[PDB]
């Protein structure tokens, strides 16, 4: 619900595509980050992997059955762990009659069916599977090695956070969904849909993020009192009709196989898989993210939640502020419209 | 035998203190009145009888594995998923159960509360303090002691141990028979009622057929999929397909008895504690021999019937071991122990 808040799609050339961080800076020079979500279609020649035939014996350690409870466009999703299985067993179940995609003509019908049947026939989600489907020799947009400043966490701190600085794989089926959330530490996220059916996304522009959580707080007051950042549990589903009803600007975009999805700092997003598919995702950062990292409201109710020490980042990139920030006197106000400094080359 | 309880309706018994004292003998008696044909029966013990003097010392009782009951479904067909939660005390459980979020809704007539249950089943998933190893009976109580009924089920070489159930509003038990098609005894110590649905054993197959029709995937994955205790079917749905069933509400101080191959289901009206165990009579042995068991899980409850066949059907042991004991169960027939009442 705002012209600069609309999701942009980008069609780089192979030459534009090579330097990932630089292309992120470019799309931010173009205002992409204001939608909180952006699509990047890689050049037709580019592939991260020659074939997906060898993955059928790949194991999904902890498939998740997504049980959704709720009504009136407000839902809570519970992730029930299932027996490990291969993507062959997963694909069988996904393509079976009980879990296959419904028959539809236009996306809007599939969306209506998603929100109508959300709480029925809980699908299984092969989510959070460690590993990459990139071949190790692919230097362009390798989710396994984006070479972003986020690397400072593993390089300097020695901390490995699975899914954040490591690649995650997601085997989806119809009605498998991801709840409204920003990334851990309000980082950037990258999502590549390797193969299969599309993943539809909803995005709330970061400028309106506080409004969304506000709405969420009003509708899940128990969850809000238990935890300030309860949306970080990734259990909260809110329908587009509720967003529209409460004046939350949002946009929707559908990601097809072979396409990239970029999530920008503090960009709340949600969505669902049309059917059987496989996506790879990880987090990344830019200089712009550092401030977000400093100000990210995190989950207080679980000890295992992702928390990154911002020390190394402030020290390296905001030396003048380090002591000030360590003193708790860094009162910088984030401007969600501003592009990342690396985009000055394009301005 | 078919002349007794022809209706197959749930019967209620009001034994005097001397009729009540011998539990096994009384099970045989209520079977001599045809109670077993409903698959479910109520026994109101004499007011003088109390298993426990008071229930004010159970706040420290620990529920090791409370389960949040997520329900998915519509049109009277649901699947329940029991999610293990963090251990809590009965005091903690009572505080949640009675809280605004989870407490019983306002209602005047039972049918209203039933309507609300079937309407809101999928929302605000409650916590069931179920399957707690324990008893609220005092040691000295020798009548109807669920902890030690001393039926032939003790011969198994724990189905015969006591289990406590701390319910809150719209906590449910799915349609099922007992493991090994055994008997069930359920005593409501205190608190709000527990409503029960039951299908006469005579018509159990019909329910199964209906169930298999509505969950073909589950049935393909497991013949006895109802034994997972995840399948909720509303009474309106049973009535729509002409499946005979009965309902009965159990109140504090009351015993419910489920009989071999009696399908039953139900829900708790609010915070309560029940205590139940399985038991057997000689009639059960054939049921045990013929019970269709859950194929798909290695840790399902499976009792070897061998000791029972030797001890109570020696003449048939060989035949049974050769897979050739094709006795047909007559669900109307009382347990032989009922002879003295016939």
């Amino acid at each position: 619900l705002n012209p600069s808040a609309r999701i942009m799609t980008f069609y780089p050339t192979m030459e534009e595509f090579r330097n990932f961080s630089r292309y992120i800076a470019y799309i931010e020079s173009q205002g992409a980050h204001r939608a909180g979500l952006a699509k990047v279609v890689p050049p037709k020649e580019w592939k991260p992997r020659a074939s997906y035939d060898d993955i059928d014996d790949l194991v999904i350690p902890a498939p998740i059955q997504q049980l959704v409870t709720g009504q009136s466009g407000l839902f809570t999703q519970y992730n029930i762990q299932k027996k490990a299985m291969t993507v062959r067993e997963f694909r069988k179940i996904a393509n079976s009659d009980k879990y296959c995609t419904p028959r539809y003509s236009e996306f809007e019908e599939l969306e209506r069916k998603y929100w109508k049947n959300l709480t029925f026939n809980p699908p299984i989600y092969g989510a959070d599977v460690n590993g990459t489907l990139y071949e190790k020799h692919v230097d362009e947009w390798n989710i396994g090695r984006l070479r972003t400043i986020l690397d400072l966490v593993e390089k300097e701190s020695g901390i490995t956070i699975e899914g954040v600085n490591t690649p995650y794989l997601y085997f989806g089926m119809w009605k498998t969904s991801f709840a409204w959330h920003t990334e851990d530490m309000d980082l950037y996220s990258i999502n590549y849909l390797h193969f299969g059916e599309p993943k539809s996304w909803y995005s709330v522009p970061p400028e309106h993020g506080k409004r969304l959580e506000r709405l969420a707080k009003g509708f899940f007051p128990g969850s809000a009192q238990s935890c300030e950042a309860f949306l970080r549990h990734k259990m909260t589903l809110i329908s587009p009709l509720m967003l529209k009803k409460y004046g939350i600007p949002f946009d929707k975009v559908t990601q097809e196989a072979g396409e990239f999805m970029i999530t920008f700092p503090y960009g709340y997003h949600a969505g669902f898989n049309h059917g059987f598919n496989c996506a790879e995702s990880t987090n990344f950062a830019t200089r712009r993210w550092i401030e977000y990292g400093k100000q990210a409201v995190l989950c207080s109710c679980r000890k295992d939640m992702v928390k990154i020490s911002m020390d190394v980042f402030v020290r390296k990139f905001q030396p003048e502020r380090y002591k000030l920030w360590k003193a708790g006197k860094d009162n910088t106000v984030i401007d969600h419209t501003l592009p990342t400094p690396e985009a000055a080359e394009f301005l | 035998s078919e002349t007794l309880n022809p209706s197959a309706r749930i019967m209620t018994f009001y034994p005097t203190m001397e009729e009540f004292r011998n539990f096994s003998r009384y099970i045989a008696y209520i079977e001599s009145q045809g109670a077993h044909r409903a698959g479910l029966a109520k026994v109101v013990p004499p007011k003088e009888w109390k298993p426990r003097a008071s229930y004010d010392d159970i706040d420290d009782l620990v529920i090791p594995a409370p389960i949040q009951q997520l329900v998915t479904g519509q049109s009277g067909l649901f699947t329940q998923y029991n999610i293990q939660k963090k251990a809590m005390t009965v005091r903690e459980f009572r505080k949640i159960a009675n809280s605004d979020k989870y407490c019983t809704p306002r209602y005047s007539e039972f049918e209203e509360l039933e309507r609300k249950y079937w309407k809101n089943l999928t929302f605000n998933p409650p916590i069931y303090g179920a399957d707690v190893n324990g008893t609220l009976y005092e040691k000295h109580v020798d009548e109807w002691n669920i902890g030690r009924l001393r039926t032939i089920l003790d011969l198994v070489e724990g189905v015969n141990t006591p289990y406590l159930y701390f319910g809150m509003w719209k906590t449910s038990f799915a349609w099922h028979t007992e493991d090994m098609d055994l008997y069930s005894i359920n005593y409501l110590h205190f608190g709000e009622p527990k409503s029960w649905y039951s299908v006469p054993p005579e018509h159990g197959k019909r329910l199964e057929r209906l169930a298999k029709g509505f969950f073909p995937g589950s049935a393909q994955s497991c013949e006895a999929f109802l034994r997972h205790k995840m399948t909720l079917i509303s009474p309106l749905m049973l009535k729509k397909y002409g499946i005979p069933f009965d309902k009965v509400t159990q109140e504090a101080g009351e015993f419910m008895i489920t009989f071999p191959y009696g399908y039953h289901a139900g829900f708790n009206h609010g915070f309560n504690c029940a205590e139940s165990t399985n038991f057997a009579t000689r009639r059960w042995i054939e049921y045990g021999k013929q019970a269709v068991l859950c194929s798909c899980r290695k840790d399902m409850v499976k009792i070897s019937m061998d000791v029972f066949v030797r001890k109570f059907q020696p003449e048939r042991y060989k035949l049974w071991k050769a897979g050739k004991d094709n006795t047909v169960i007559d669900h109307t027939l009382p347990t032989p122990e009922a002879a003295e009442f016939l």
Partner: peptide, 13 residues
């Protein structure tokens, strides 16, 4: 995963 209990199939996440 899951384990069987008197009251049914209990899912321990």
């Amino acid at each position: 995963x899951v384990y069987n209990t008197r009251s049914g199939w209990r899912w321990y996440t």
